[PDB]
Design an enzyme around this catalytic site. Sequence first.
Site, short mmCIF file in Angstrom:
data_model
loop_
_atom_site.label_atom_id
_atom_site.label_comp_id
_atom_site.label_asym_id
_atom_site.label_seq_id
_atom_site.Cartn_x
_atom_site.Cartn_y
_atom_site.Cartn_z
N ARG A 54 -6.75 -22.98 -26.26
CA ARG A 54 -5.82 -22.41 -25.32
C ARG A 54 -4.98 -23.52 -24.69
NH1 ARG A 54 -1.80 -19.21 -23.77
NH2 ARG A 54 -1.43 -19.53 -21.55
N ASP A 112 9.25 -19.48 -30.82
CA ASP A 112 8.33 -18.95 -29.84
C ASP A 112 8.93 -19.41 -28.53
OD1 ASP A 112 6.43 -18.24 -28.07
OD2 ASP A 112 4.82 -19.46 -28.87
N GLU A 157 -0.51 -15.12 -23.25
CA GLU A 157 -1.80 -14.92 -23.92
C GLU A 157 -1.91 -13.74 -24.86
OE1 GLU A 157 -5.31 -16.09 -21.48
OE2 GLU A 157 -3.74 -15.98 -19.92
N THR A 205 -0.71 -18.84 -31.60
CA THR A 205 -1.75 -18.64 -32.59
C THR A 205 -1.08 -18.21 -33.89
OG1 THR A 205 -3.38 -18.05 -30.88
CG2 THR A 205 -3.85 -17.34 -33.13
N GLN A 253 7.71 -16.16 -20.07
CA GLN A 253 8.74 -16.26 -19.05
C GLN A 253 10.12 -15.92 -19.62
OE1 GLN A 253 10.57 -20.17 -17.18
NE2 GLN A 253 8.78 -19.65 -15.94
N1 GDP Z 1 -10.51 -13.10 -30.44
C1 GDP Z 1 -9.19 -13.39 -30.45
N2 GDP Z 1 -8.62 -14.44 -29.84
C2 GDP Z 1 -7.27 -14.46 -30.03
C3 GDP Z 1 -6.52 -13.55 -30.72
N3 GDP Z 1 -5.19 -13.85 -30.65
C4 GDP Z 1 -5.21 -14.91 -29.92
N4 GDP Z 1 -6.37 -15.35 -29.46
C5 GDP Z 1 -6.60 -16.18 -28.32
O1 GDP Z 1 -5.79 -15.91 -27.21
C6 GDP Z 1 -5.72 -17.04 -26.28
C7 GDP Z 1 -4.24 -17.20 -26.00
O2 GDP Z 1 -3.47 -17.01 -27.20
P1 GDP Z 1 -2.09 -17.78 -27.40
O3 GDP Z 1 -1.78 -17.60 -28.81
O4 GDP Z 1 -2.26 -19.10 -26.73
O5 GDP Z 1 -1.11 -16.86 -26.65
P2 GDP Z 1 0.36 -17.10 -26.06
O6 GDP Z 1 0.16 -17.38 -24.58
O7 GDP Z 1 1.01 -15.77 -26.36
O8 GDP Z 1 0.89 -18.15 -26.92
C8 GDP Z 1 -6.13 -18.19 -27.11
O9 GDP Z 1 -7.44 -18.46 -26.72
C9 GDP Z 1 -6.12 -17.57 -28.48
O10 GDP Z 1 -6.94 -18.18 -29.45
C10 GDP Z 1 -7.12 -12.48 -31.34
O11 GDP Z 1 -6.56 -11.61 -32.00
N5 GDP Z 1 -8.48 -12.48 -31.15
#
Ligand code: GDP
Length: 315
Positions: free
Chosen positions: A147, A169, A12, A17, A173
Site C-alpha cells: 500500500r 492513473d 484504495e 494494483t 482527488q
Molecule cells: N484482497 C485484495 N486486495 C486488493 C485488491 N485490489 C487491491 N488490493 C489492495 O488494495 C489496497 C489499495 O489498493 P491500491 O491499488 O493502492 O488502490 P488505489 O488507492 O486505487 O491506487 C492495496 O493494499 C491493494 O493491494 C483486491 O481485489 N483484493
Amino acid sequence: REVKLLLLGAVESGKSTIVKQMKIIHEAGYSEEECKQYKAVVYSNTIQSIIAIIRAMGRLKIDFGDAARADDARQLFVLAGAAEEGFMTAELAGVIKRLWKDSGVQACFNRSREYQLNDSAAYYLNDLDRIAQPNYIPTQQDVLRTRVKTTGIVETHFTFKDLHFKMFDVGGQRSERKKWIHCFEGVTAIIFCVALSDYDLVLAEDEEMNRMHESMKLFDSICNNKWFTDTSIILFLNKKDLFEEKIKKSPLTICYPEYAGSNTYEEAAAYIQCQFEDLNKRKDTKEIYTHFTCATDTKNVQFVFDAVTDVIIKN
Ligand SMILES: Nc1nc2c(ncn2[C@@H]2O[C@H](COP(=O)(O)OP(=O)(O)O)[C@@H](O)[C@H]2O)c(=O)[nH]1
C-alpha cells in the site's frame, strides 16, 4: 493505433494494483532486485496494520485474551516508535506474532469495519513467519499487496494485439475535479474502479460517510459527463474476493437498507452492479461494460483485460 486509458476511482479501489499488473503481464515484471525495494514497504505495511488493531482495541474497549500481551503491546511501540523506516527483526517478529495470535486481538480484528485497517493487514500477518526472514525478498503477490499512495499521475505504455496502450492513473482527488478532468476529453476508454468490500465502511475523516456511496456519486459524475460520450466506460467492481467473504457475515442492508434480496454473493453483487449501471442517464445510447475483478490476481486481470481490449477494438 495508440489507445489511451484513464483509470478512475476512489482511494484504495485498486488503481496502482492494476497499473502494477500491466507491468507483470505485458512488460518485464518485477525482478528479484526490484522486489527487494518493497521489502521495506511490506514491513511498514505490516507494522501499521498491527498498531491500528492494537490502537483500536482501546477505542473499542476490547481486552487482550492474555494480560501478558499488554507487555507486547508496549514493546511494539518501543521498537516501532524508535525506527524511522520499515525494518524487521526477530524480537519484533515475536511481539507481532504473539499479538496477532491473541484472542482479544482477533476480536478487534473481526470488527475492522469500525476502524481503518489496510486490506492486506491479514495477509502479511499470516505470513509473518515468511516475511520476517533475515533475507526475505518480497514476491510478486507481496508487491501487489503493498500500500503506497500515488500522489502524482502515473502512466504506462505496453503493447497488446498490435495495439499500443497508454494507461493513466490520476488518483482519487483528480478523479473528482470536475473541471480539470476535462483535459482528458478524447480518451478511448475509462476504467472506473469500485471496491465492493467498502459497502460496510465509513470514510475515515468523515466516519459516517459511506464509501460505496461516495464512489457511486463519482461514477455518476464521470458516466454522465459531456466530455466522455465518445469515451467507453468500463466498470471494475474490484475486490470481489474480500466481498465474497464479507457478504456472508455483513449484510448489504448496511449499505442499501432498501435491499430486499438475500445476502448471497450472487444476489448482492448483482444488486451493486445494477445500482451503478442505473446511474447512466444516456442508457439509451451509452453502454457500460461491467467486470468483477480481483486486481491482485494476475490471472483474473489478464482474462479480464483480454476482454476489455476485445471491446475497444470493436468500437
Ligand atoms: N484482497 C485484495 N486486495 C486488493 C485488491 N485490489 C487491491 N488490493 C489492495 O488494495 C489496497 C489499495 O489498493 P491500491 O491499488 O493502492 O488502490 P488505489 O488507492 O486505487 O491506487 C492495496 O493494499 C491493494 O493491494 C483486491 O481485489 N483484493
